[PDB]
Write a protein that binds this ligand. Sequence first.
Ligand SMILES: [Ca+2]
Ligand SMILES: [Ca+2]
Ligand SMILES: [Ca+2]
Ligand SMILES: [Ca+2]
Lengths: 148, 36
Amino acid sequence: ADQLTEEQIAEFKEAFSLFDKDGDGTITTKELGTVMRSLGQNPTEAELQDMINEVDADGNGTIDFPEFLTMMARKMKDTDSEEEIREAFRVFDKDGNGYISAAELRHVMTNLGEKLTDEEVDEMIREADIDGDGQVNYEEFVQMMTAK
Amino acid sequence: GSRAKANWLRAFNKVRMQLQEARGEGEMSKSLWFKG
Ligand SMILES: [Ca+2]
Ligand SMILES: [Ca+2]
Ligand SMILES: [Ca+2]
Ligand SMILES: [Ca+2]
């Protein structure tokens, strides 16, 4: 499924062992601090955590081998969804997280017709709430529109 | 009843169509490093 060539990934593995000094299978902005500093670039700690947490998928503030490699592959058409469901979650709750609450869902309701109350949201969440938490997680949303 | 069926449908679907709007936009998250 749009997999990189063994030579491209293999070369990254060697560069990873030489570039990575933490001894972990992931990349950390600290390592970036030392490399960018060596090439004449010394960004502030804020830019380090920012640039690193944005380049890695999920944004844990570090780029794992698959996260960085996936971003490089993103240049080529990978999947039709392209994680577009994340954008749905980002709009459901400006908050900046991936969880839809009964109120936030009512906000998406606002986007269409129908006016709803705490009852109509608890019911809509009752359907997706497989966890029984009265809220809808990422897998629940895709369980509705994707139902994989 | 069925209040959630049509509304909720339009809900997750409301963002589903909205996801396309975000696509086709310039993103600088890659920043340096990715250039290599
Ligand atoms: Ca590391
Ligand atoms: Ca990450
Ligand atoms: Ca939320
Ligand atoms: Ca749930």
